[PDB]
Amino acid sequence: VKPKAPKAVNPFHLGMAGYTFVNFDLDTTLKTLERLDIHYLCIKDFHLPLNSTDEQIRAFHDKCAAHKVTGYAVGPIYMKSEEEIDRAFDYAKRVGVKLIVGVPNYELLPYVDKKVKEYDFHYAIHLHGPDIKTYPDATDVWVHTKDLDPRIGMCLDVGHDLRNGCDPVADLKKYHTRVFDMHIKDVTDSSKAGVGIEIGRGKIDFPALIRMMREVNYTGMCSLEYEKDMKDPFLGIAESIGYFKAVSDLT
Amino acid sequence: VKPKAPKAVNPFHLGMAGYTFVNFDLDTTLKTLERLDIHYLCIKDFHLPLNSTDEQIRAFHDKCAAHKVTGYAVGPIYMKSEEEIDRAFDYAKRVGVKLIVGVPNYELLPYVDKKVKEYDFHYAIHLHGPDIKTYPDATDVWVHTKDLDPRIGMCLDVGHDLRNGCDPVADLKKYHTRVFDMHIKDVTDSSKAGVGIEIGRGKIDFPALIRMMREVNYTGMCSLEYEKDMKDPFLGIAESIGYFKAVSDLT
């Protein structure tokens, strides 16, 4: 009997983005993560509403822990006014996280700056690809944040970046000092016409991504945001996780 | 935009072993393979009974084709008398396959020899690991077949082989001339106490297996036989397929 090769060491943590489970309750979400050996969840309002009580927040944490899951950040949370920003930062504090994934209107970036100073939280702007005018890609988030507080950056969405015609691995190399979260997913083309697909079936260079994360020592989460078959996504979620685990282990 | 590496070329074909779906009908089985991009199914009696009519066989083939699946072999079929052997070979011919996965009593091996000559079919004996007295491992199948017709060999079950304390990659190197089918699966230990687990989570050295299949030019099927959570196996089936696809692509 000959032991297989040791699995490679990686600085990042595997998680799930909450939108993957937009059509499912928290019970179903946590049970699925548990079965997939995934220990991190980005928290969405459809699982933990912003006005949840202190007791409801405790109950959320306890359920997460019972399934060996940590809620590591909140969002994406879209923010179109200072009041929404105020509410999002207070919610993060109440939930006990220090990372907020957000989509603030451009004119509100100075206010986000004020709030990251007040709370000492990181704030990761979710880039959205070529269908959306604001924050289409990693460069656009960079240009809007590079002169602001160091705690403001991006949720590097590798799929949307590639669909905008950008190399997400080269963007990670350039912009790593402001990449605070990541959505992993795969796409069928490096254009607006690219659609979501199971990880490994599409165009994203995962081996390159994994090597680059090691090279820049990315220590955040790589959170699967699976946007295919969203009314019955389980088979695709699990195949994508398997493929990504293997790339993580063998690269 | 930089294209990812071309996927590696492999001589084998990815399939599914029918026992994976012992608790599910053929519709559910074919739909699952279709969604997983799997094109080969080993045919079990609970999906296509041995006394199925000619019309039922046609209907089976048409349904398989509609889901882009080929039924590539039949079995495993346990055989404890010459009559059962007679019935299995005639069934294979009626179903239009040339490979039978079987478990014949040892004393019936001469009759299997007679039947492979009569029909010109390959016959792959499913080895069963340390819990079962007959055909516990690849060496035992080898010793019982090496002097018989060249068309009689083994369904190399990598999980059961490892649980018997055997190296399935070294067994493949030794015995490739008589490996006509393969069950892929993973296990938690190289002992009787090893249980099934998602591919990649266990002890089987898949990269080594893939390199060895290239080295001996194994052109048969690697059929997933998933024996965990068998009342709700979908998540584990899909993770295992993802992991194995990645190993196939990147090794």
Side-chain angles (χ1 to χ4, degrees), chain A residues 7 200-201 239 243 245 249, chain B residues 7 200 239 243 245 249:
Chain A
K7 297 177 176 180
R201 300 191 194 191
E239 179 179 341
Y243 199 101
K245 284 177 177 183
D249 290 349
Chain B
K7 297 177 176 180
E239 179 179 341
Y243 199 101
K245 284 177 177 183
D249 290 349

Side-chain angles (χ1 to χ4, degrees), chain B residues 69-90:
Chain B
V69 172
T70 297
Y72 79 92
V74 293
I77 302 170
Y78 283 66
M79 306 176 206
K80 66 179 167 300
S81 73
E82 288 188 0
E83 186 216 276
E84 288 181 8
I85 300 170
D86 290 343
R87 288 177 178 179
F89 273 79
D90 178 54

Side-chain angles (χ1 to χ4, degrees), chain B residues 17-132 134-202 204-233:
Chain B
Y19 187 69
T20 296
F21 289 95
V22 64
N23 292 319
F24 301 89
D25 63 24
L26 182 62
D27 299 322
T28 299
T29 298
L30 293 173
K31 282 171 184 166
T32 309
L33 274 59
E34 186 172 38
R35 289 188 70 194
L36 298 163
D37 196 33
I38 296 173
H39 300 286
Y40 298 104
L41 175 61
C42 197
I43 304 170
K44 281 294 294 187
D45 59 355
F46 50 76
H47 292 152
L48 186 63
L50 273 65
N51 290 308
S52 298
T53 69
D54 291 354
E55 181 168 306
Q56 288 177 317
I57 296 169
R58 289 199 297 282
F60 171 87
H61 290 313
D62 289 342
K63 203 192 184 310
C64 281
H67 298 279
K68 296 138 286 173
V69 172
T70 297
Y72 79 92
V74 293
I77 302 170
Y78 283 66
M79 306 176 206
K80 66 179 167 300
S81 73
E82 288 188 0
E83 186 216 276
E84 288 181 8
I85 300 170
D86 290 343
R87 288 177 178 179
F89 273 79
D90 178 54
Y91 166 75
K93 180 168 180 179
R94 291 180 66 241
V95 173
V97 300
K98 301 200 180 29
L99 175 58
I100 297 174
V101 186
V103 187
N105 290 11
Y106 285 134
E107 70 277 2
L108 299 171
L109 285 167
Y111 198 76
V112 175
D113 187 290
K114 187 188 250 183
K115 287 283 169 172
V116 299
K117 287 175 164 61
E118 176 184 4
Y119 283 80
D120 190 22
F121 294 165
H122 283 75
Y123 190 103
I125 297 163
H126 191 207
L127 69 89
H128 282 139
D131 296 301
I132 291 73
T134 306
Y135 312 118
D137 69 10
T139 300
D140 188 70
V141 177
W142 181 259
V143 310
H144 284 90
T145 63
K146 58 174 262 296
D147 287 341
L148 302 182
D149 193 286
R151 291 164 292 194
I152 306 173
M154 71 186 74
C155 172
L156 172 61
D157 186 311
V158 301
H160 290 322
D161 208 44
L162 192 79
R163 289 176 60 251
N164 212 51
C166 302
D167 179 343
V169 178
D171 285 353
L172 175 64
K173 184 192 282 174
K174 289 184 290 190
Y175 307 143
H176 72 275
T177 56
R178 292 179 181 274
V179 175
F180 299 132
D181 191 59
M182 193 181 301
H183 289 185
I184 55 166
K185 55 182 67 169
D186 213 344
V187 293
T188 62
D189 195 25
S190 52
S191 69
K192 178 186 272 197
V195 304
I197 196 168
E198 291 89 338
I199 288 182
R201 300 191 194 191
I204 293 282
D205 190 341
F206 284 98
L209 185 69
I210 287 282
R211 287 184 207 103
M212 188 56 66
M213 292 186 286
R214 291 171 191 164
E215 168 182 330
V216 303
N217 196 43
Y218 177 73
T219 61
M221 276 58 176
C222 297
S223 285
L224 174 65
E225 189 169 59
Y226 193 70
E227 305 171 320
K228 170 171 178 173
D229 294 330
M230 301 195 80
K231 297 174 275 271
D232 186 14

